[PDB]
Amino acid sequence: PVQRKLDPNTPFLTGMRILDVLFPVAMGGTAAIPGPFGAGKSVTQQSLAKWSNADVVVYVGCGERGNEMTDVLVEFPELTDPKTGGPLMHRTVLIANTSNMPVAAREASIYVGVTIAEYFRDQGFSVALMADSTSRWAEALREISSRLEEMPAEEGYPPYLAARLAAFYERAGKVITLGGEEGAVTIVGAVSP
Amino acid sequence: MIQGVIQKIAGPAVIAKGMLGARMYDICKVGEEGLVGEIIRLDGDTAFVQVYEDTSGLKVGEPVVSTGLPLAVELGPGMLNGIYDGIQRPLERIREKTGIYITRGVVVHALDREKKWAWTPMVKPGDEVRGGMVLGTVPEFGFTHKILVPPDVRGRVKEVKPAGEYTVEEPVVVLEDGTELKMYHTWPVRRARPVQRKLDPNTPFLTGMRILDVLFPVAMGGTAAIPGPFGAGKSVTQQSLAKWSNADVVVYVGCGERGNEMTDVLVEFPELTDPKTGGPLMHRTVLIANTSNMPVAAREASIYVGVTIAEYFRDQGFSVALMADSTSRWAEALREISSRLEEMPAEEGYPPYLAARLAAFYERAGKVITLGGEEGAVTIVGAVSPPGGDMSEPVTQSTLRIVGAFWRLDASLAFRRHFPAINWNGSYSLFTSALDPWYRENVAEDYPELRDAISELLQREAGLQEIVQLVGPDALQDAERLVIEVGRIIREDFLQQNAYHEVDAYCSMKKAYGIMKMILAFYKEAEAAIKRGVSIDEILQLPVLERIGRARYVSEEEFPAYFEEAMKEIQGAFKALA
Amino acid sequence: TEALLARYRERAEAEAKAVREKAMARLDEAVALVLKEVLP
Amino acid sequence: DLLKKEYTGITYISGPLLFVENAKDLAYGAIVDIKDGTGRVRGGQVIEVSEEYAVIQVFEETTGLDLATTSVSLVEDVARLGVSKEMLGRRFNGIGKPIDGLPPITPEKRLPITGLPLNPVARRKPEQFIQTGISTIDVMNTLVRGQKLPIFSGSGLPANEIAAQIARQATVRPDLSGEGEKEEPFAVVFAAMGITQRELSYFIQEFERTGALSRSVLFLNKADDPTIERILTPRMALTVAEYLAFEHDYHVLVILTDMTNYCEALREIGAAREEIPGRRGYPGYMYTDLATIYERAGVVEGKKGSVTQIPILSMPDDDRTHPIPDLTGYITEGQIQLSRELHRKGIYPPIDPLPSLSRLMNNGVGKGKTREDHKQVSDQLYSAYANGVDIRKLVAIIGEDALTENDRRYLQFADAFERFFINQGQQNRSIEESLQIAWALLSMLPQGELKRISKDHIGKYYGQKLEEIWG
Amino acid sequence: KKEYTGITYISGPLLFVENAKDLAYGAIVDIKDGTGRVRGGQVIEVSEEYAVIQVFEETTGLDLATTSVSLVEDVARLGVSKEMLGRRFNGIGKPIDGLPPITPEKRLPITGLPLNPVARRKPEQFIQTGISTIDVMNTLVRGQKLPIFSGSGLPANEIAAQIARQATVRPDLSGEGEKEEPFAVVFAAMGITQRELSYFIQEFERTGALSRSVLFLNKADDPTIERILTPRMALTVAEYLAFEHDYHVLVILTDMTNYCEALREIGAAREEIPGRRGYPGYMYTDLATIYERAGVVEGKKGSVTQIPILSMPDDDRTHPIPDLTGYITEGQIQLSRELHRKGIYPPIDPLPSLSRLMNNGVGKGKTREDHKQVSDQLYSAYANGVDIRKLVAIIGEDALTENDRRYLQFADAFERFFINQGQQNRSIEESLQIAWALLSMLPQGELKRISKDHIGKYYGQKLEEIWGAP
Amino acid sequence: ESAGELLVATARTQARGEVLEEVRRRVREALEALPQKPEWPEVVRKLALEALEALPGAKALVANPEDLPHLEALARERGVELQAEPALRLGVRAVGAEGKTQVENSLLARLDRAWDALSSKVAQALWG
Amino acid sequence: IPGIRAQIRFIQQVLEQREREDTFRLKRIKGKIEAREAEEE
Ligand SMILES: Nc1ncnc2c1ncn2[C@@H]1O[C@H](COP(=O)(O)OP(=O)(O)OP(=O)(O)O)[C@@H](O)[C@H]1O
Ligand SMILES: Nc1ncnc2c1ncn2[C@@H]1O[C@H](COP(=O)(O)OP(=O)(O)O)[C@@H](O)[C@H]1O
Ligand SMILES: [Mg+2]
C-alpha cells in the first residue's frame, strides 16, 4: 500500500543523450527494449545501472541461458559505482534463474523482484528495476497454463497473459509512501520476440 | 479352453465376459459362426476382441472361445503362384466353395493338403540339426523349395523318408525326441524371424526405371517410400517394379485398395515372362489381397502376413522384394479400432503407437546371413497416401525418419501427363555412395561422374528457374538459356519413361549410361559453340536433337550401334560448322 | 607393418597371463568374502 | 418368426438416437418399428447392443415421442430389400416404399442391403468402350463399362445437365471392336439424397422426354425429408442394380445425385456417437463407409451384365482437398472435374481436362477397340494444353508483345482448344468426329513439335484444317 | 524378492496392479509372464488402490492369471566407471559389444541436478574440430551448446562421425599450456536404423577413435522409454568424467527430432493434453534440462561441450523443435541442400550459421590474433560474391566492373577450396593459411575489416600453397 | 597402431570378466551345500523371520518339505500357517493375506541381487 | 507482397482454429473418460 500516486513530472535521467533527450522516461514510468544479438543491450543496461540517478538497482534474470547468466554474474562484481568509487554491487540485488530451474521459480521471479523494489521504495528511495527477457517469463506462464489444461488463446498463450503483464507493470510509479516520504520504481523490461 | 459369452457388440468390436485367463493378442472364435477375432484388451473378467470379419446379425449371449495361440501363418511349399486374403486363406478355394461373393466363417487351409511333392532328402540318420538348416529339397515352378528346420528346434535325426512323393502333412523327418518335422511349420506374424547376422548393402535393386535406378538408387536390402496424392502414379510404379525387378521372389500386398487392381494383376501376370528365368511371371509372385470393402481389422494382419512370407523366402536364400500398396490404410484401420477402444488420440486421431508399429514393420528388411549359413535379402517399398497431398501428415513424417530412399510424387507433373512424375527437388537417396564400386565394376568406370554432372545441371536449372519466373526466359543471357534448354531436354528425353510402351517400359543401366553420355556430349559442344559466337537460337534446331529425344524407344539390343551413330553425329554436327 | 601387431598380441597375452596369476592367489579370499556377505 | 414382441422401457431420446434397456434379443443391425401414443409407426436400426441397453437410430423426426407410452418391436434381424424384375419403371422414397401410388411389388427375393464383397478372383477386366458423345471424356478420359467415374462439381455448375446428357447419349460401339452386334439399352438406377424440387423436376422431365422412365428405378430422398434416411438410399439402389445386372444380364448405369448430403448425414450420426473425428469433424470410418458403396460396381467373369457408377458431388468451397472429394478420389477410378472459369466464359460442358483422370482408359482404347492413334493423340493434347496454360501465366507478367512465335502458337492453340474441343453444347459427337477435331487442332502446331505421336500417325492424319469442318 | 500378482487391467502399453502402495513413483520393475520371459516397465502413477505401469517393449503374451510384477530399483540409476571408455551400450547401459559388464565405482541417478549458477565460470578456450567453416567462422568453445541444423537427405551422420574422429584440444597455442589434458567423446544416438548403426560402428573402429569414446546407441525398433532415457545416461557419464576426473568431454546427440517424437508419444500414452502443434506443453523445460547440463565450473579443470544434431521436420525453422532449441543454445550451424546437390562436402552454409560465444575463445593467447578480423572479412566477401553471382545471370559478366568479377571469382574459389575439404583434417593454422590465400585474390585496400598490420604480415600468398594438395 | 591397443584392452577386460565369473561359480556352488551343514535350521529360521518381518500382516508361510521341520516352532509362535512346497529350495516364501502379494528369501536370489554391489569389493580384494 | 502476406496470415488463422477445435475435443473426451471411471468404475 501507498498513500497516493503522483504524476510523472520529473525525469529518470539515464545519462545517455539519446534516451534522456529524444525518448525520455519519467521517474516512475515504464520502458521496453528489444534484445537483438550483437546490439550491445547488456552494455546499455549496465550503463543504466551505473549512471542513472536511482539509489538502488534490482536486476531480474528470469529464464536466461546458463552462459549468459554466468556473464552477468561475473561482470557486476567488477563494476565500480561512480558516486562513491566503491563496488556497484553494494547497492544492487540480483535475482538469477536459468532455463533448467523449476518453472514456478521462473514464473515468480519478476514478482519477487518487484516486491523487493516496492519495499526499498517504501523506505523512501528511488529504485530502478530491470527485467531481462520477459518473453521467457511468458513462456513459463504458458507452460504452467498447459499443465493445468486451459484453453489457449493466440499462439498458445493463456487468455490472461495481458492481465498478468499489466499487474506486473502497474506497480511502478512515484508515490507518497505510508511514512510520508517520496519514492519511485522505474521498470525497464526486455522483450525478445 | 477359455470360454465366455458376448456382452456388447458395436461394429467390429466385441466385448466378451467370463474370459479370465486369456492372453493378449490371442485368436478367438466369436459366436456360433466361429468368426476369427483377436484380443487387444483385458479388463478384470472381460476381454476386448476385434473381429476380422463382418459382425452384423450377432446377438448378445453367443459363445466366445479362445484358442490360446496368436495369429500365425503356415510356411512351406505351395505359396508361390497364389492369392490370399488378409489372414492367409486361398481366394480360389473360397471362390469354389462360395459363389462370386465372400462370406463369413469359411475355413480353408493355406497350404494345399492334397498335392504331392517330389521329396529329396539331404540329411542322414544320426546328424545333429539346428533351426534353419535344410532337410531336403522340393521342386516348385522351376525353383528348388528347401525344407527348413523351424527356427527354434534342436536335436538329432533318427530316421528320414526315402526319396519319393508326399503331401505337406507327411512327417518326413523324425528326431530322437519324437518330434515330427513336416514339410511346413507355423510362425507368429508379429515376431521377426531370427537371423545369424545383418550385412551392409552393396548391390543395387534394379527397378527398371531410369530416374529411380540412377538418381535415387536403392540397395538390395534397403527400404524406400513413395508418397503422393491420388492419381500421381504409385500403383503403376509398384506394378512396374513387380514386372521388371531382378528380385527372385515378389510379394505384393494390397492393403485396403481397389479390387480392380488385384484383378488386373491376376489377369496379366500369367501372360508375362520372368525377366531372368524365362518362365511365367506369376510363378514368382505371391499376392495378399484385402480390398477396400473387406473387413477393416484384416488390414493390419495383411501387412504382417506379407512381411512374414517375405522373411521365410529370405531364409531360404532368395532375394525378395515386398511392395505395400498403402500403409495409410493400415494407419486408418488402427485409428478406427482405437476409436472403438475409446483411447486418447495423438495428432490427427492416430493412436500414439503408430510410429512404433511402422518402425517395427520397416526394420525387418535387410541383407542377412541366414541361420542356415546362406545369404538372402528383403527389400521393402511402401506407398503412402497423405490426405489432400499434405506431406506434413503424421504417417509421412514418421516414414521420413526410417526409410533409406524417398521418392516424392508431384501432382503438377501428373496433371500434364509427365510420368513417372517424380518430384526431383523433394526426393533423395542414402544408398548412392555405397553402390559406387558396383557401378564402376558393372556399368562403366566413370558412371558416378556422369551422374554427378547430371545432378549439377539439374541443380543449376532449378536455381535459374527462380529468375525465369520473374523476368521470363528471353531476358536471360545465352549461357543461361542453354542451361535451361539442356534441363528441358533432360526432363523430356531421359527422366520421362512410358510404362505402357513395348520398349520404353524397361530400361537397362547401360542404356541410361549411353543416353546420359550423349546428352553431356551435346551440352559440351553447345557450350563450346556459344563461347565462340554461334547463336543459341540456331543450335535448338540442329538435326541431332530429335535423335537424342527419340533414343528412348530403341530396342535394348540395337542400342550400341545407335549410340555409336549418334556419338559420331554429335561430333559432326558441331565439327562441320567450326 | 604386421610386426607391430604381433608385438601387441604378445604383450596382450602376457598381460592376460599376469592378471590371471594375480587373481589365482586371492581367488579363495574373494570367494570367502562373498560367501560371508551374502548370508544373513 | 410370426409373433410380435414389444420392448417398453425407453430411457433416453435425443436427436437421432434412442435408448431401450431390457432388450438383449435385438441382433446388431436389426430393423425395428417405433410406435408412440397416437399409433404412428417409425423405423429404426440397432447400431449398438449390450446387456444394459440397445442404441437405435431413428429414420424420421422424433417429434411426439415420449418415455411413457412408446414401444419398440422387431421387424427383421438383418436389413433386407424385396427386389423383383417388375420394379423397372417405378418410384420409391429413400427407404424403398412406393410413392407413385401403384401397389407394392411382389418380391422374388429378399436381399440384404449391405451386400457382400466381390471376390477378386471372380472379377473381370473392364474393357468395353462407352461412347458418351462428349469429346473431353471420349478422347481424353475414356469411360469403360464397369467403371466408377464420379463428377466433381460446384454450387452453380451444371453437373446435373452433364449427367442427364451422358445417360441420354451413352452407347457402346460393337462395330469398332467387332463384338456381337447387340443394341440393348442401358437400365438406369437413380438415387437422390437431399435433392431439391428444382433439380428433381429437371431430371424427371428429362427422363420423360427421352422415354427412359420405363427402364428406370427411382429412389428419391428430397431435401425436406428426414436426414437419417440417406444412410440407406445408396445401399438399396446398389442392391437393386447388382441384382438386375448379375441375375438378368442388364447393363445398369447408376447415378447418385449428391454424396455430400450423404456425408452430412454420416457426420450427424458420428457426432451423436462421440466418434473420433478425422479431418474437419467427419468420422474416422468414412473411408470404409464410402468404399462399401463405391466398390459395388464392376463386371463379373462368366456373366453378361455390368454395373457402372456416376456419382455426383459438390466440392464445398471448390476445394479439391476437402475430405469428401479426397476420399472419393482415393476410392474411385478417376474423376471428371468441372471448372468455374470455363463456366463463366460460356463453355459447356465446363470440363477441365487437366485435373480429370480415367484410370481404366488404357484397357478400352487402342487398335481393334477404337483406333490405333487414340492414346498418343490424347497424350499430345495434354502436353500442348499444359504448355498453353503455362504461357498464359507468363503473358500475365511479361506482356503479350514480348512473346516469341512459338509461345504465340501455343497460346492460340489453347484458346482454340477451349473454344472448339471443350465447348460443344448439346450435341452428340461420335468418336471419329472428336478425333478429327483433335487432329485439326493439333495441326496448328509445327509437325516437329508432336513428340508424343509416332511418325506413321502424323503422316496419316496430320494436315487437314479446322475450317473444313466449320467455315 | 517381493512380487505382486493382482493385475486388473492390460491395454496398450499400460497395466494396473493392485495393493502396490510400496512402489515408489518412477520406479523400475520386472514383469514376468507364464512362459518365464521377463520384460521391463516403469511406474508412472501410484495410488492407495492401484499403481500404473508403462511396459517397455510389448504386452503380447501377458494375462491376468499368471503375470507378476516385482521391483528392480526405486530410482533409475547408472553405474559409472572410467573403464567405460571404449565400450558400447544399448541406451539403458546394457553392453552390446560382447565384453563383460563393467564394475561400477558409484551409481548415480540419471536425471541430473541443476548446476548452481554461481558455480559456473565463463567459457574461454576453443576446440579444434578440423573443419574450416567451423573453426574459422563459427568457432566452438569449451563449454558451449552449438547445435547442427540439417534436413532430410543431408549427411549429418558423416559430419558427426568426422567431428568425433577429428576433434581435439590445442594446449600448445594457449601460452605454454599443459602438454597432457584428457579428451573423451560421448556419443548418443536416438532412433537410428541398422544401416546407420553399422556405419557408426565401422567409423569408430576403423580409425581407433573408439579407445577414447563411449557409445550409447538406441535403435528405431527399440522401446521409446529407452530413447527418452538415452541422452540422460550419456550426460550422466559426461558429467561424472568431466567433474571427477578432469576430462574434456564432447557430447554428440545424434537426432533430437526422434527424441521429441518419442516424448510426444510418451505424453499421449498417459492422457495428457498437448500444447502447441501437438507437442507437450513442458517440452521447453525438458529440452532445457537436457541442454543445460554442459558448461565449465569454477575451481574445476574439466568441461562438458555439446553438439546436438537435429533434422528440421520440413526445413522449417518455425517448427517448435528448432525454435525451442534456438532459445536455449548459443547459435547454430546449418547445412545447405544446394551445396550438397552441387557436390560439396561438408555442406555447411556460412551465411545462416552463427556462433554466439566465438568472441571469447579466439584472439591472442588462443588461436591467432587475426582470427576475428579474418572471419568477418570472409563473411562480407562471400555475401558480396553470392549477390554478384545472382546479378550476372541477368546482366552478364561483360557488364560488370572489375571488382564485381573479382568477387564472383572469389566466391567460386571459396566454395571449391574453403568449404569442399572432403575427409581432410585441417589444423587451425592450415585453415587460416587457406583463408589468407583466398583473401589475397581480392585487391589490398578492399580488405576494410582487417587492420594494416595483419595485411602486411599475411596478405599476398598464392593459392598454390594449398592448391599443391587441396 | 590402434588395433593392437584395442586387442590388449579387450584381452585384459575379458580376463577380468573370466576371473569374476569363476568367483561367482565358486560362490554359487558353495551356497548350495548349506542345507547339509548343521547350521541350516538357524539359517532357515533367520530367513523366515526376515520374510515375515518384510511382509506385515502375512497370512501363511510356504517352504520346502525337508526344511519345514526346522520352522514348525516359528509358524505357531508367529501365528501363521505353514505349507509344503517342493519347488522352493534353500529359502522360504510367505503369501500375503489378500493373496495378491508374496515375498521370497531364497539365497540364490540374494546372491544375484547383491553380486553387483559386491563386484567392486571382489575386484579390490583380487587386484587392489 | 501484401497479398501474399494476407494469404499467409489467413492460412495461419485457419490452422490455429482447427488446432483449437481439436484441443476442445480432446478435453471433452478426457473429461468423459474420467467421469465414467470415477462414477461407474
Ligand atoms: N555503449 C557502447 N559503448 C562502447 N562500445 C559499445 C557500446 N555498445 C556496444 N559496444 C560494442 O559493441 C559490442 C556489442 O556486441 P556484444 O555481443 O559484445 O554486446 P552485448 O552488450 O554483450 O549484447 P548482446 O548480448 O545483445 O549481443 C560490445 O561488445 C562493444 O564492443
Ligand atoms: N509411369 C506412368 N506411365 C504411364 N502412365 C501412368 C504412369 N503412372 C501413372 N500413369 C497413369 O496415371 C494413372 C494414375 O493412377 P496410379 O498410377 O495408380 O497412381 P495412384 O496410385 O497414385 O493412383 C494410372 O491409371 C496410369 O495409367
Ligand atoms: Mg494406388
Residue numbers in the entry:
A (entry chain B): 194 to 386
B (entry chain A): 1 to 578
C (entry chain K): 81 to 120
D (entry chain F): 2 to 472
E (entry chain D): 5 to 474
F (entry chain L): 61 to 188
G (entry chain G): 169 to 209
Give the article text.
V/A-ATPase is a motor protein that shares a common rotary catalytic mechanism with FoF1 ATP synthase. The V1 domain of Tth V/A-ATPase (A3B3D1F1) is an ATP-driven rotary motor where the central DF shaft rotates inside the hexameric A3B3 containing three catalytic sites, each composed of an AB dimer. When powered by ATP hydrolysis, the V1 domain rotates the central rotor against the A3B3 hexamer, composed of three catalytic AB dimers adopting different conformations (ABopen, ABsemi, and ABclosed).
Cryo-grids were prepared using a reaction mixture of nucleotide-free V/A-ATPase, containing the regenerating system and ATP at a saturating concentration of 6 mM. The reaction mixture was incubated for 120 s at 25 °C and then loaded onto a holey grid, followed by flash freezing. We determined three rotational states followed by focused refinement using a V1EG mask for each state. In these structures, nucleotide densities have been identified in the three catalytic sites. The V3nuc structure, obtained under ATP saturation conditions shows all three catalytic sites occupied by ATP or the products of hydrolysis (ADP + Pi). In the V3nuc structure, where nucleotides are bound to all three AB dimers, three distinct but associated catalytic events occur at the three AB dimers simultaneously and these events are coupled to the first 120° rotation step of the DF shaft.
